[PDB]
Amino acid sequence: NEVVADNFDVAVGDITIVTNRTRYVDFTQPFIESGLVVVAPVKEAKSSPW
Amino acid sequence: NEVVADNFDVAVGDITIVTNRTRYVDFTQPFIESGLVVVAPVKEAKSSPW
Ligand SMILES: *[C@@H]1O[C@H](CO)[C@@H](O[C@@H]2O[C@H](CO)[C@@H](O)[C@H](O)[C@H]2NC(C)=O)[C@H](O)[C@H]1NC(C)=O
Ligand SMILES: *[C@@H]1O[C@H](CO)[C@@H](O[C@@H]2O[C@H](CO)[C@@H](O)[C@H](O)[C@H]2NC(C)=O)[C@H](O)[C@H]1NC(C)=O
Numbered sequence: 001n002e003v004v005a006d007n008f009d010v011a012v013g014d015i016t017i018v019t020n021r022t023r024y025v026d027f028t029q030p031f032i033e034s035g036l037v038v039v040a041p042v043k044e045a046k047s048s049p050w
Numbered sequence: 051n052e053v054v055a056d057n058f059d060v061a062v063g064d065i066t067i068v069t070n071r072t073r074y075v076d077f078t079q080p081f082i083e084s085g086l087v088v089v090a091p092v093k094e095a096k097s098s099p100w
Contacts, residue, residue, distance in 0.1 A: 022072040 003011050004024045016034060017027055053061050054074050066084060067077055 017069050019067055019069065019072055022069055023076070026073065 001024075002008050011025075015021070015027075017030065021027075052058050061075075065071070065077075067080065071077070
């Protein structure tokens, strides 16, 4: 939202292509690929005596 | 592609917002929600004395 309001002519970094982000600025092609994954602690597979 | 090359001023239909399509044209707000699902045959688990 600063790039739209002319404060920074280009934001370089971890900026991730979302749909309303592509409306207001105009990205390049992606230079790395990312997706949301879920990390969670590893645990046992067995339940109760039930 | 026939809106970028200005043969049509507006494509009204079932056009789905993808992150190239938001890049080359402008969309409205999403008036209906959609997502890719996987349809498949149901489980027909039999039950008989056979
Ligand atoms: C998608 O991104 C746009 C761009 O920032 C968001 O629109 C802005 O929303 C803030 C809310 O405080 C306000 O400054 C304005 O309504 C918008 N800024 C503009 C037009 O410069 C929009 O809210 C985002 N969508 C969602 C669902 O969060
Ligand atoms: C991304 O979307 C665009 C639009 O369909 C495609 O990129 C180019 O778009 C121009 C329109 O001005 C066409 O003339 C080019 O032929 C398109 N490039 C190619 C290689 O066909 C592009 O097809 C889309 N990206 C992907 C991966 O399909």
